[PDB]
Structures are given as C-alpha cells and as structure tokens.
Ligand binder design. Structure first.
Ligand SMILES: [Ca+2]
Length: 133
C-alpha cells in the first residue's frame, strides 16, 4: 500500500499484526507466520525504517503495544542477529538492554511508542508482531 508519508520510495513493506489478544504469538510463531506469507519478521536497519514503522503504529491507533521484531540472539561473536539475515548494525536498545534477564531472554521486542526502543524478552512471550516483505 502506498506510503504517502515516506520521504523516499521503497518497494519494501512492513505490516503490523494482532487486533485481539488471542492472536498474539510467540517469537517463533510470529517468524513462521511472516514466512508463510513470503516475508519475515521485520528488521529495523536505520532510522528511516524506524520512522516508517512509527507512522504505521500511529495510523493504526493501537498504541503502547509490544511487537516482536526479527531480533534473536546469535552467538558471542555475533551478538544479536536479524532473522532475515541482515547484520545488526543500527541499534535502538532501551536503557539497560539487552539484559538477558534471568538468562532466558533471547528474542527482541519493540515498544510501540515514540521511543521505538527494543528490549530482549523471553521468546515464548505472547506479543504482537511486525512482518516485512
Ligand atoms: Ca530484557
């Protein structure tokens, strides 16, 4: 769908998900859902993509929700990775994150407010999610 608010043209498309609580998915379920449509969980690779997603969040009127992104812990040599294979270069971790709290947080979620900050959280948490194609 045409992004009238974009400041530059791209054919890449982000889509926000989950209107109701029962729809919410684990990180793995969200990854699989987006791949079943031919894409993947969203990666956020620069500030422009972050702003594009923030436009989608405000346009959807679904505020202050948490969304799975494609962030997942890779290894000590890599740190975090994106499920779509992009290197984690741009980062927007919240203060004190990622913190692998209690040794069980290996997936990344977006706080859908103007900060657009990321936090690592347990992959089995039920969240909204963002796909990209
Ligand atoms: Ca955390």
């Amino acid at each position: 769908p045409e992004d009238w608010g974009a400041s530059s043209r791209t054919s890449l498309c982000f889509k926000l998900y989950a209107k109701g609580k029962h729809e919410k998915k684990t990180w793995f379920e969200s990854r699989d859902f987006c791949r079943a449509l031919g894409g993947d969980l969203a990666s956020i690779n620069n500030k422009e993509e972050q702003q594009t997603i923030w436009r989608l969040i405000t346009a959807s009127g679904s505020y202050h929700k948490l969304f799975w992104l494609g962030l997942t812990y890779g290894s000590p040599s890599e740190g975090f990775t994106w499920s779509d294979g992009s290197p984690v270069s741009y980062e927007n971790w919240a203060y004190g994150e990622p913190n692998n709290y209690q040794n069980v947080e290996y997936c990344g979620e977006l706080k859908g407010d103007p900060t657009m900050s990321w936090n690592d959280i347990n992959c089995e948490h039920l969240n909204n999610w963002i796909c990209q194609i």
